[PDB]
Nucleic acid binder design. Structure first.
Lengths: 105, 105
DNA sequence: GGTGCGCATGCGCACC
DNA sequence: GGTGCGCATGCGCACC
């Protein structure tokens, strides 16, 4: 874990939302923003090993969330929505920002 | 004029900068963000008449600031940097956010 | 609502 | 520093 004061608050267009209530569409939009704030870089570097975050979930490929590239079997163990929530949850935890993650509870 | 509480503050990565001291590079980055906050839309709609802001400067084409498309003569009356500052200044004025524009003075 | 995908668009490289 | 430009990338359309 490595604290990052710079992760955004779990709000969309201002309204506070918990990660568990974000829609698939909202998550897909939130995740690149979280990555920009998380790394300071303007571009995620999707797919490049050198840019794979340490907290990236293991049963998801390091790939643009634009289009789910998981294996068909991977898609049965976990829904694409649950997978996108794991991406967010894993990023906030690894930065020790559980305060922000569980704020809406 | 139409007040917009939602225009960003004239800061880059946190540091406050006046529009007159922004570098060409910084301006090119700032302007699309200003447009997003200005309109609520995710995409500027560069070139489309239906999206041309009313405050757009007259001696600049409605075109991605990525690449200066002004006529060669237009480029002599006004430098590309001065042109990009006019874009910002005109947007903040038309939204009545002179408080933000002249903050650093 | 979920999700693939078309493509506009802005990050940052390249070169002066 | 200035600026053109290559192209990765995420907004939002399309369709279920």
């Amino acid at each position: 874990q490595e604290v990052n004061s710079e992760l955004p608050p779990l709000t969309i267009d201002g309204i506070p939302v918990s990660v568990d209530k974000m829609t698939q569409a909202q998550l897909r939009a939130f995740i690149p923003e979280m990555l920009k704030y998380s790394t300071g870089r303007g571009k995620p570097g999707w797919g490049k090993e050198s840019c794979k975050p340490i907290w990236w979930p293991e049963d998801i490929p390091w790939a643009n969330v634009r289009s789910d590239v998981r294996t068909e079997e991977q898609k049965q163990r976990v829904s694409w929505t649950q997978a996108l929530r794991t991406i967010v949850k894993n990023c906030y935890k690894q930065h020790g920002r559980e305060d922000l993650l569980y704020a809406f509870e």
